[PDB]
Structures are given as C-alpha cells and as structure tokens.
Structure 1
Amino acid sequence: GHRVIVSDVQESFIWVRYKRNENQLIIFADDTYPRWVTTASLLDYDTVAGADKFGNICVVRLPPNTNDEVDGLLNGASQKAEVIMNYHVGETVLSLQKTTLIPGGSESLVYTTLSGGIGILVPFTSHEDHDFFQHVEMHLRSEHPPLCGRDHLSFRSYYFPVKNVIDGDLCEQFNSMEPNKQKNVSEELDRTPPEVSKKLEDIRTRYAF
C-alpha cells in the first residue's frame, strides 16, 4: 500500500516511497548483492522473495531500523537490506506465489521452474521440528551421498551459501534406503524408522498433498 519494490536486471531490489502530497518518488533502501532477478513476491510489509536466472531463491528483509520518511555508503542508497535466506534449486524459477493449497491447511510459498517442476517452501513453527529435520539432513548427507559424486551442501551453495533451508528432497530419501542403514540412521536420532517416516509425512500433509 505505501511502498514500491523495483527489480533491476542485474541489481536485486530497490525500495521506493511515493510522497502523495509532494508528488515525489524517493529511493530509501537497496541491497548489497548483484542479482539477476527473474521474478519477485511480497511476503509482508518488509520482506520480499526473489528468484534468479542462475537457479537461486532468496528472501530479503528490511532491518527494523529502516526509516521510510526520506527527503550512499557503497555508491548506493544510505540504508541497506539484509539477506535472511539463500537456496540453490538447480532450475530457473519464473513464478513465486504465497498461497494455501489444501482446504484447511497452512500457507506455503509455491514456486515454478523452467523444466516443468513444481515445489514449495514451508516455514517451521517450532524449534524441535527444525532441530530434528536438521539432524536428519546432517546424517543423510554422509550416509547417503549423491549418486553422481556431488557434495550435497556444496550443490545447494552453488552461487551463495545456504541460509535457513532444509532440503526435504534429501530427507525423504530415507524411506528408500535399505533397512540396515535406516536403522543406523534412526538409532542416532533416538527413534525407530516408522516414527521417522511418520514425522516426514506429517509436515508434507500439513501443507501440500
């Protein structure tokens, strides 16, 4: 309602305010990274989700200090925005949209890819779920490595290091391991394989199908 978000072909995001009574468009914030933006989506009054030509998704948020009423420090704008999320998808995203997919479910961020893929990014609501899924990802990175010789953490850090994303496509490969390795993985999380499978299915059915 109040602000304007601009996407540059090579710079990431510019924040502008329209002065209704002065008839002025003033730049009051920008970013510190070059991004080849393909699409953008507003998440709330301060946060923007962006996509890239090189296959990355990022979330950028204004610091709470941010002053809207303006009338460079890096040859740019005086105030900067912080990057709170970085993820390499592996395919070029051209659509981002916040929506609820199932009746009586929760809101997720649905993205779309140039290869015909569809995916979601969903938020965690508690620290326990986040910690459990983080440990699952850690243990599956070592005992179930990618098939063609790639490092999983290095692949999701292709252009920028990963920040605050858990790869649920690596995590659901637990259901396709052999029972011996499923037991070796599950007994480190202090759990049985059926409980891990149920916990994996719960977060998926909470948001998507």
Structure 2
Amino acid sequence: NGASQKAEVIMNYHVGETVLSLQKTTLIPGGSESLVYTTLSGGIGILVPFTSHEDHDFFQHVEMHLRSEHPPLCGRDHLSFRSYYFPVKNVIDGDLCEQFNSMEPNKQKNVSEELDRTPPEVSKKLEDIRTRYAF
C-alpha cells in the first residue's frame, strides 16, 4: 500500500527460537562465507549456500526421505513446523539431514538404497559440506 515498487521475498524459514543477531562472515581459515545467527536460547547456527545443482538435489532427496522414515519424535510434521507462519522457501534442514547418522543400520541401508548409494557415502557427503564452512 505504501510505495509503488515492492520487494520480493526469496527465502522463508522458521528457526524455532527468536534470533537477535545476524552476520555474514567466514569462520575458519581457508573457508567460505556463512550467515551466522544467534538465538535467545543460547543457540548458534549458520545458513550456507549450495555450490552446484547436483549438491542441492542430493540434500533435497535426503531431507525428503527422512521426513517419512524418521518423523519427529513428538508427533509434529517437519514441513509443517518449518512452515509455521510462512511456507518454507528455499532452505534445506541439515539438522534433520544429519539425523541419518543416528538411525539404525536397517533404516540407513533402506535410505541409502533409495538414494542409490552406500551409507558410508551418505555420511561423507554430510561431513563435507559442514567442514567447508563451519567446523
């Protein structure tokens, strides 16, 4: 209503805690830039970009399969929780993606068969994006 020209939203994400700090910086020597945030609960997290399309498609599939095979522990829907006030837009949840390493070997085998890989190969791709930006 105010001005004629309007800005576009290109990203939406519910974090779960109230953020009071945001900064774009590099955290490790010889690493890439992240967006760092801190919450009112004492949490520190980062938001990092994908390098290629093929990386982004792999993590999307992992998140899509863990949403059904490893659903949240208190009966919430993951997509619904991340769409709390606005629908999620262009963010993958690596906290869910990294619960792969805590699953039972049967479920790890099934999910790796679905992704056409080996469980050690899935675990190694997760560690690779983490050590590229943060520790």
TM above 0.5, yes or no, is yes
More strand by share: 1
User: 1:120 offset after TM fit, Å?
Assistant: 0.1
Q: What secondary structure sits across from 2:73 in the alignment?
A: coil
TM (norm. structure 2) is 0.99
Residues 15-64 of structure 1 deviation map (CA, whole Å, 9 limit, x = unaligned): xxxxxxxxxxxxxxxxxxxxxxxxxxxxxxxxxxxxxxxxxxxxxxxxxx
User: 1:76 offset after TM fit, Å?
Assistant: 1.0
Higher relative contact order (CA 8 A, sep 6+): 2
Q: Distance in 1 between matches of 2:10 and 2:52?
A: 18
TM (norm. structure 1) is 0.64
Q: Distance in 2 between matches of 1:136 and 1:168?
A: 10
Counterpart mapping for 1:71-150 below 5 A? 75-150=1-76
Instruction: Please tell me whether Structure 1 or Structure 2 has the larger radius of gyration of its CA atoms.
Output: 1
- Give the root-mean-square deviation of aligned CA atoms: 0.4
State how many pairs are aligned. 135
User: 1:181 offset after TM fit, Å?
Assistant: 0.3
Residues 85-118 of structure 1 deviation map (CA, whole Å, 9 limit, x = unaligned): 0000000000000000000000000000000000
Gaps of 5+ in 2: none
User: 1:125 offset after TM fit, Å?
Assistant: 1.3
Q: Distance in 2 between matches of 1:188 and 1:181?
A: 10
Q: Identity across aligned pairs (percent)? A: 100
Gaps of 5+ in 1: 1-74
More helix by share: 2
